[PDB]
Amino acid sequence: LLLQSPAVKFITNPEFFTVLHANYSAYRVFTSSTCLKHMILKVRRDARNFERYQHNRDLVNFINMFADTRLELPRGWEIKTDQQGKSFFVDHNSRATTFIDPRIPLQNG
């Protein structure tokens, strides 16, 4: 499940670590964690782990560091927002909701 999600595509992409190192603060979040780094490495080894960790707040916040909110949302996605302005993302294509912004890199192999 979720093997074609933007988050799995990004985390398991050949160039994930290049994109990570190019974002210094994201690099700090990854490098200095224990649990987040462990979860990212588990997903990279076995992508089934992403669905298992999909709503984990630290994983969501980390992947959202890479979101480019200047881009259009991809076809079929909708943003909804909290009274507190927290955004969530509905992929009406797969009828699934996530806190992770689909406008993250490394989506196409």
From Swiss-Prot:
It comes from the Eukaryota. Predominantly expressed in neurons of adult and fetal brain. Weakly expressed in the kidney. It is found in: Cytoplasm. Residues 71-104 form the WW domain. E3 ubiquitin-protein ligase that mediates ubiquitination and subsequent degradation of DVL1. Also targets the mutant SOD1 protein involved in familial amyotrophic lateral sclerosis (FALS). Forms cytotoxic aggregates with DVL1, SSR3 and mutant SOD1 that lead to motor neuron death in FALS. Interacts with DVL1 and SSR3. Also interacts with mutant SOD1. This is E3 ubiquitin-protein ligase HECW1. It comes from Homo sapiens. The lineage of its organism: Eukaryota, Metazoa, Chordata, Craniata, Vertebrata. The gene is HECW1. The chain holds residues 948 to 1056 of 1606 of the full protein.
